[PDB]
Amino acid sequence: SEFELMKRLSEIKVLPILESLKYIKHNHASVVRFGDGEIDLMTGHSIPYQDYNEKLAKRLQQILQTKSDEKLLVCLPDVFSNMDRYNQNARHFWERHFLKYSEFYLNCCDAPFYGSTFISRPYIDLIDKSPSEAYFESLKELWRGKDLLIVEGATSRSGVGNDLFVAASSIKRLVCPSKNAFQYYDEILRLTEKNAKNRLILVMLGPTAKVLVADLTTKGYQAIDLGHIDSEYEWYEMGATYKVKLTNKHTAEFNYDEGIELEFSQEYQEQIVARIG
Numbered sequence: 001s002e003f004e005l006m007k008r009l010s011e012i013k014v015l016p017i018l019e020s021l022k023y024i025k026h027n028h029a030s031v032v033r034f035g036d037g038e039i040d041l042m043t044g045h046s047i048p049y050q051d052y053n054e055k056l057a058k059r060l061q062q063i064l065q066t067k068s069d070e071k072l073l074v075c076l077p078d079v080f081s082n083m084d085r086y087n088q089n090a091r092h093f094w095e096r097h098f099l100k101y102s103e104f105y106l107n108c109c110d111a112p113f114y115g116s117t118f119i120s121r122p123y124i125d126l127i128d129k130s131p132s133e134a135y136f137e138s139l140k141e142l143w144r145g146k147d148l149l150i151v152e153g154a155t156s157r158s159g160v161g162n163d164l165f166v167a168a169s170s171i172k173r174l175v176c177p178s179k180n181a182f183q184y185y186d187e188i189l190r191l192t193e194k195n196a197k198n199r200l201i202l203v204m205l206g207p208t209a210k211v212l213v214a215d216l217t218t219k220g221y222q223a224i225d226l227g228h229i230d231s232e233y234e235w236y237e238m239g240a241t242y243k244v245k246l247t248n249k250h251t252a253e254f255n256y257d258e259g260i261e262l263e264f265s266q267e268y269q270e271q272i273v274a275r276i277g
């Protein structure tokens with residue numbers, strides 16, 4: 001019954017984090033990741049930071065149907081095999097998720113392989129956190145010495161107050177809405193293009209990020225969907241063992257963005273090229 005579905009879905013093949021990073025670097029590929037929220041949206045549901053939207057839903061479906069080629073790595077949650085890597089609560093969440101969406105997952109994902117959606121989630125739900133340093137060190141090699149364009153939300157503040165991007169040669173940021181960024185999609189795409197000349201683009205923008213990465217990739221740019229990497233890095237730096245709320249910025253899975261004390265970070269402010277919303 002349900003278990004038969006769990007087993008059928010284990011036919012989906014995901015390159016785990018460290019392995020995914022190698023594909024990206026070899027092809028200098030854009031990366032687009034599909035997580036639980038994207039499945040929610042595609043099957044018709046609103047999620048905490050993005051209301052359901054038909055065109056977004058169609059685009060996401062189209063993007064997931066794109067085979068991982070040389071220009072793009074398409075990622076799925078790395079939960080279809082070796083679930084034992086994750087804590088019990090994560091395992092329960094993910095199995096319930098892919099069974100709720102058995103109709104979707106049984107018909108959506110026939111590509112020979114996928115990257116790991118957890119390249120942005122390399123710490124908090126793991127039982128053995130040892131490879132995390134290797135994970136974060138390997139991630140950092142994507143931007144060491146690069147000029148970056150970071151497209152993210154107002155509360156995202158990726159790298160703010162930590163050393164995640166210390167080795168980037170420069171950072172420019174396009175700061176978009178923290179929720180429902182798709183309401184402003186046309187502008188976000190327009191300014192990302194204008195600001196992306198000779199830069200590696202990193203996108204932390206929920207479901208909108210996926211369409212952005214795809215459209216950018218169509219227009220020739222390399223764009224990497226990095227989602228909640230900052231939350232996971234903050235948790236890691238703290239040596240955290242559970243999802244603790246951050247006080248100064250957005251925190252993964254505290255997605256209402258309530259109770260935040262924003263700070264003035266002059267370095268962050270000097271990186272901002274434009275605000276949208």
Ligand SMILES: O=c1ccn([C@@H]2O[C@H](COP(=O)(O)OP(=O)(O)O)[C@@H](O)[C@H]2O)c(=O)[nH]1
Nearest residue numbers: 120153156178179180181204205206227228
């Ligand atoms: O309309 C939105 C949707 C989300 N985000 C940001 O998108 C990031 C999370 O992206 P995603 O859902 O892809 O993360 P994942 O959990 O898959 O890593 C966070 O910084 C959110 O603040 C945003 O700024 N605007």
